[PDB]
Amino acid sequence: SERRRLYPPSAEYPDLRKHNCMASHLTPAVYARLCDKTTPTGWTLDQCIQTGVDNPGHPFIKTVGMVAGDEETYEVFADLFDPVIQERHNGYDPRTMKHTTDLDASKIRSGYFDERYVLSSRVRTGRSIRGLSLPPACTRAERREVERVVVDALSGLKGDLAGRYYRLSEMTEAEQQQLIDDHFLFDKPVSPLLTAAGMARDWPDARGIWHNNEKSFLIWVNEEDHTRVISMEKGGNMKRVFERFCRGLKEVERLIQERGWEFMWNERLGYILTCPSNLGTGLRAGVHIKLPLLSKDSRFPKILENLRLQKRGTGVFDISNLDRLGKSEVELVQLVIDGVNYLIDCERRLERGQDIRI
Amino acid sequence: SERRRLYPPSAEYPDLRKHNCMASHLTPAVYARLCDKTTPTGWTLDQCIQTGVDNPGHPFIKTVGMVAGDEETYEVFADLFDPVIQERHNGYDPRTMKHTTDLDASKIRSGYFDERYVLSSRVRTGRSIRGLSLPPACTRAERREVERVVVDALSGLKGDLAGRYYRLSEMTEAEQQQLIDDHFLFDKPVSPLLTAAGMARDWPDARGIWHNNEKSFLIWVNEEDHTRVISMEKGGNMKRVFERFCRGLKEVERLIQERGWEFMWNERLGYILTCPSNLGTGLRAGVHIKLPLLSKDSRFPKILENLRLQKRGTGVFDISNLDRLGKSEVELVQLVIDGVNYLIDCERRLERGQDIRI
Amino acid sequence: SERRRLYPPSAEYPDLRKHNCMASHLTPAVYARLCDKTTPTGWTLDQCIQTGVDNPGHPFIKTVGMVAGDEETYEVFADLFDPVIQERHNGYDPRTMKHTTDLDASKIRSGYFDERYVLSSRVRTGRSIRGLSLPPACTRAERREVERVVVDALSGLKGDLAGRYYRLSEMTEAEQQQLIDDHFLFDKPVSPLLTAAGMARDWPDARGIWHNNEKSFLIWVNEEDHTRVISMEKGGNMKRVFERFCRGLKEVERLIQERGWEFMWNERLGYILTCPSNLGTGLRAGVHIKLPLLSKDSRFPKILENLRLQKRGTGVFDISNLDRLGKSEVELVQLVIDGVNYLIDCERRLERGQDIRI
Amino acid sequence: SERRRLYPPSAEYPDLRKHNCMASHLTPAVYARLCDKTTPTGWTLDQCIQTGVDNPGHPFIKTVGMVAGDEETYEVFADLFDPVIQERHNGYDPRTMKHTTDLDASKIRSGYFDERYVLSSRVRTGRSIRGLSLPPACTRAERREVERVVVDALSGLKGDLAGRYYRLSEMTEAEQQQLIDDHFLFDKPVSPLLTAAGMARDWPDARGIWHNNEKSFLIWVNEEDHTRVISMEKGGNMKRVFERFCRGLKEVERLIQERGWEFMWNERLGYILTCPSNLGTGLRAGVHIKLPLLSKDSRFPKILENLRLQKRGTGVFDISNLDRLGKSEVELVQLVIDGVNYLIDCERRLERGQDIRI
Amino acid sequence: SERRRLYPPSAEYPDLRKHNCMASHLTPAVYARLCDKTTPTGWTLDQCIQTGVDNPGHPFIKTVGMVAGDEETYEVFADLFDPVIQERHNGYDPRTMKHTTDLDASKIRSGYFDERYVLSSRVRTGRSIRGLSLPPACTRAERREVERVVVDALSGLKGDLAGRYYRLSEMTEAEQQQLIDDHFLFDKPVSPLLTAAGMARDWPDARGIWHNNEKSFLIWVNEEDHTRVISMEKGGNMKRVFERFCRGLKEVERLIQERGWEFMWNERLGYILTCPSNLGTGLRAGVHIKLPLLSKDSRFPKILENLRLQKRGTGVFDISNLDRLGKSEVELVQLVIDGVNYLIDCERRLERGQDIRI
Ligand SMILES: Nc1ncnc2c1ncn2[C@@H]1O[C@H](COP(=O)(O)OP(=O)(O)O)[C@@H](O)[C@H]1O
Ligand SMILES: Nc1ncnc2c1ncn2[C@@H]1O[C@H](COP(=O)(O)OP(=O)(O)O)[C@@H](O)[C@H]1O
Ligand SMILES: Nc1ncnc2c1ncn2[C@@H]1O[C@H](COP(=O)(O)OP(=O)(O)O)[C@@H](O)[C@H]1O
Ligand SMILES: Nc1ncnc2c1ncn2[C@@H]1O[C@H](COP(=O)(O)OP(=O)(O)O)[C@@H](O)[C@H]1O
Ligand SMILES: Nc1ncnc2c1ncn2[C@@H]1O[C@H](COP(=O)(O)OP(=O)(O)O)[C@@H](O)[C@H]1O
Ligand SMILES: *CC(=O)N1C[C@@H](C(N)=O)Oc2ccccc21
Ligand SMILES: *CC(=O)N1C[C@@H](C(N)=O)Oc2ccccc21
């Protein structure tokens, strides 16, 4: 009979009285409006907000609290994501503003650093294959398809960017631990965020690591995104690292389109990834820095805020950029270079004169 | 989205903690089983049990608490009705037992009564036109169709059983009151049972009374059933009353089938009516009796139970038969005749010697 | 087979030849147009107009004659309701005009009355929970859900507006009668209007009364609407009564949205209720007045019409406002205050000089 | 399997190589376009054109060659009917032009004729009840419903226009023949045109004739349309005939809307009837005329064409108007009056001087 | 909305109060049961019974009154046809009994007649192509397909049974009349039975006559069935006529199956045709006889009944067999031969001694 009554959407509304951006930007009207929508692959709003709902989030710590199951999610649930995307990326408006992508290593300047605290340099991005559900919603078949596509493409790389693909299922635990310690691998997700998002399913099936012979170019397959590209260099020649990064990414993309596959990408958001915080470009060019001359400073938190830098624990700190949506890859790399140059120029403990220089 | 959850059937289960036969024979399993069924016309279980649920029923008073929206109901909701029908009709089992219908006025004997307390004699039955929803569920169009069919059929009656059809909408209030007082009309339903059953809808549209010239043969159209046939006689010659009743009913049925209409009827239940208490034949042959020599008796209620008689208030009492399902019309009339003959014979106040004679 | 023919809509058209606003504003074209529409929950036009069709209405008495089964009704059947709403609320046009709601007790002035005939003061409004069918169409599950939501919300009230919820099913008949006499309860619906609308179903299941300790703030749950809020004061300090009313209503609404529920509300109509006469705000601020110095007046009905006041029997009269749609709550309260001030000022029997003062 | 192929629409195209307006205005493109459309009641193009296809039509005789099964037909198959309607009604364009209806008997003048050849006067129109399929497609139930509606409405007529309804099924053959001879009945359809359209189905069930006591106002029920209204007068006082016609038609329409029924009517076409030739108003005001002074004239057909008159065989000729769509009823009646006045003024055989006077 | 109510089937029941086998074997229960069924091609019960309903049938004349729209009709509507088939074919029971078909011309004996009244001899049968709707329901495309199949098949005939196909649309009226007079053509259907059955649609499109050079073997395409085969001989050598008939029929069937087409045929009924009277074999072997020595006999109708013969008007009488279902073709031919031999043997007017000899 059609006279049976459904649960009112308000009955399913989460209890967000002690939470922290989905919780603040989710309202009864929005949930009721989106309670019945769904992407063509079956993704639904509750699945998007499950990770945030499960984890209330510690005070003073801002977490997005949602994920996307496929490309169509950002369109179907735009009314919810858009405020979150805007709040995350310091005012960027997905509805109106547009994103531009450039990967030219000629524009960059400076590049060379000073071997004082740079230690190492790295650049990282993510890429999702179109037509395949994202890790939060991907099934075993889709995950295996992503792995096959990426592996077959990378097999065609020639020259310096030529290496091998190692499957987690076929790798010894000791070797995996050694690679993790050497910063050349990813660990099994254990924090509540990933598992609540449902991205540790079927571990370690269909997760792998492709790295070049020199180990200066790595690609994680099915860890947080369909592909996570990394260009590393145990030094401070960010120019060369970014050059290798962009050229290898271009070659990988060319090989992807050769077989008929395309990276998810649209003008409003750019490259599409799971975490809305990683939308835009996904670039996280950064470096490692030392504790002594820097830890005992006066007000570096304000300095980092002024120069748009993100400081986190190594694994001595790690300094990178904050926002990926909006600015372009070359812009973000230049910003990081200028910020680290300022940091290593005004680090002087021999004298004083820190200027911040917003 | 198909992920939304319906209200569990147990959520809709009525609160029958202070009720009296649907309440005792309705259980969570039955409601859950039938919570989704429905007759082809859209009748549902909640509609069937609404009248009983609304009225808890006074203690010591047994009411069915149920109705049917059409014929298919008794099939669709048989798992629920059948215990109620069996409990009502003192053990009759609809599932196994079968019903037989006869209307021969030759079989009856005796007939003539004594003008002591008989006063008046009456016989009543009900009939439902197949293909049309019953009064609880009938719409305006179906009610008008029932009225048209019945009126056109009765127009063809000739001879003694020839009279006129009076429409309630075209009848003065004073005339209606006079007819009601003369026991030749039906009043607007006001008791909670009928209104809760939803049978007072659109009153007085499409309700009428067809009566012969002598007013000894009446038919109420759309009051409690599609048709309520009555044969009256201000006397005690039950033989003649039943003869006229059966012959007129046969003629009316013949005229009904002439135009292609059929009375609802199936072997298990016989003629189909709204109240499950009226199933079977609907016959309620009875008479009116006096107070003085009778009310002051010793244990008449036991006598009535023993002889299978129903005593109610006139409008001095009214005595008739109890059960309609099972026994046949001739059987019920003979039982009533024998019971009233016993009552009048063993009414002796001049002496004693009541024998009950179960 | 698809060759079977449906009943033409004109066949179902009611017989309104002796009725009084649905009958005047219902025409064959409108019924034919809306004969097949239905709200997503299954509400249909015939259900809306059943209450008016059953009750022809006494001459010179204006009754709306229709009800709404849910919010979408006012949209789906707008072509029928809109003329009715406009005729009821003295020219307000739902299609074009818009409604504004304010609940500020600072704007009100005067407030204090004279203890001559004021006796008592009261304010009343209604509120419907979104996502749940209205009482005319609500099922048992939806009614229980409404009761649970309201009770859980009111449990969070603290301070002066803190009290208890009493369930009808768990309340003695004598206590209920005493509360009714004290004007602190609602009686079981018995008028034909209520029952024909199907709002007495399942009585008294899921009907309750929540009142504060001082009994100056009451809330009827599932009597005529999902919630009926009342603020009472056995005096004439309308200012304080309205202050308590608005602050308590704001707190109740806040607690409602805390759990994810929202009151039905749209700009064109404001708060959505069953009777179209109660649309807009539902406010009926009024007072009780005495008979002697007032009943024997010259042309008080003209005075009430001029000052936009409604006078009805107590249970000495009750004087309040007429229209709720259009004017705002503060506006209506101020109008009532000014009207009663005029009445108690121009009540002079010591002398004459009534001015009406349209 | 869905791989099976339907017959191409061109396969069903009729063989119209020796036909006469459907054949000229039906083309392969139109048939292919409309080969799959259908009115909600199931009417299809082939049904519309069946009557024209079966009857090739004699040369020099123009017949419409199509009919409509219901109102929606004229909308659904407008691409085919519209050229036919325009060609029939001498240039009227249904798509752009609009129709206006008036029935005032005050506007008419003259009226009185000369008892030379007028003999008798008559006016005729047709009317279709909305919501019921037209005779070509109506089933038995719909035909009976039309008859019931018309009979119940006409029962309410009072005064001069009060009479009786006679059913064909209950009328003797001799009486029917006498009525036909007296021009007070219709004969069983036998022409191939009628039967090919399927309008003689179930004869004589549900066909009747309602006529007033004076027999000056007749109504044929279910002969060519749902209703055919006729006002007759064995004389030449066309003014009185038209007055009675219009007033009786107004009363009948009022009684129709009283019960909730409406005549089919839309601005573009006016009153909707089966034959597209009868669209617009259906008025055929005319008279009977004699042979001698008129037949042996010079160029009578030219005079009729110039004056917009239609001359046909009585059952001495019968002269009326040609077009119904476009001009209004009063306009058509005035045109007929002027034409007959001119005919009876220029009929002079005593002398010559015919002027035609286009 | 799904709350709208269909017309009850009893509303559509025909008015058969003055009819004659469908009318007697159609009852309200059967019509109600079959009111919604339909063959896969859309044939419905009302279409089947339309021909009988329209024509009441003269008293003392038995007509089947129904037709079939396709092969599946006899199965879908078996509950109605089966009593009619049984009543028509003197007790044959389609449900239980089975039909056997033989066409061997060796079994027949006698054959040669006496040139006294035989005059001419003829044999006729019908055949329907499987997968194509029967003439009552066939569209233009299906009719053209039947014509194409039959013509292409007959083109392959060689030897004595070689001739030409003449299309009605391409044949002069005078030639058609001459062929009709010579008993070598069929006339345009005009009887009410045919037109009511809807088998004169689109005349003369797709109707033809294929005849051999000697004109002793004819085939009517799309006149009453898809194919009507006839073998004629202006004499009395029934043996040769039947031999040619059976051999030509076998050759035609072989050519039909060559292209992948099959004659409709099932064991219960045999060859499937429109009129249920023609079911079984369709054989009507007969002869023409003279008036003088035969008309003036004593009890010829009794003789015809006893010998199972049918006498009808020529176009002097025509005598053939009565029943086709049951007995086989050879059986029917032998019965006709024996009956005519008896007739021409006991025709003696020179003396008496008629024996009837049931
Ligand atoms: N500049 C760097 N130099 C060396 N190792 C790095 C650098 N940046 C990141 N890593 C390594 O990457 C690993 C994971 O980094 P993570 O916090 O997941 O970055 P992301 O989230 O951008 O992938 C760590 O074990 C860390 O050692
Ligand atoms: N034997 C009788 N004599 C006279 N009137 C009777 C008799 N039986 C019933 N009636 C009349 O029938 C009316 C309604 O009876 P009711 O209780 O409705 O019987 P039922 O329910 O079987 O129709 C009463 O007003 C009563 O006067
Ligand atoms: N100003 C008032 N003072 C005291 N009691 C009141 C006042 N207004 C209403 N009531 C009480 O409310 C009860 C029901 O009122 P009702 O007519 O239903 O108003 P509404 O329809 O607006 O709820 C009555 O029993 C009456 O005593
Ligand atoms: N002016 C008239 N006077 C008398 N009888 C008339 C007149 N006009 C029509 N009739 C009668 O109407 C009958 C049918 O007319 P018909 O040709 O069907 O007109 P329509 O098609 O407009 O109904 C005829 O038998 C004829 O006698
Ligand atoms: N034995 C026969 N000899 C000559 N012509 C015949 C004979 N039988 C039938 N016909 C011709 O067949 C034509 C139509 O016959 P019909 O009554 O339609 O038979 P059926 O219905 O079996 O086809 C008639 O014109 C008739 O002349
Ligand atoms: C930013 C990110 O990678 N996130 C967002 C974070 C959250 N819900 O706030 O949790 C998860 C879980 C799994 C994968 C990615 C993230
Ligand atoms: C027996 C009868 O007519 N009933 C049953 C009774 C009940 N619910 O127990 O109430 C009603 C109401 C309406 C119509 C019939 C009955």
Ligand SMILES: *CC(=O)N1C[C@@H](C(N)=O)Oc2ccccc21
């Ligand atoms: C105005 C009101 O509260 N109404 C309207 C009234 C009518 N039909 O005119 O009937 C009912 C019935 C139940 C509840 C409310 C009302």
Ligand SMILES: *CC(=O)N1C[C@@H](C(N)=O)Oc2ccccc21
């Ligand atoms: C014009 C008219 O009344 N027609 C049209 C005519 C045709 N097909 O040309 O056929 C029929 C048949 C029945 C009723 C009316 C008409």
Ligand SMILES: *CC(=O)N1C[C@@H](C(N)=O)Oc2ccccc21
């Ligand atoms: C027997 C026969 O050929 N029939 C049956 C007859 C009837 N309805 O009784 O009518 C028709 C019409 C058309 C073709 C065949 C028959």
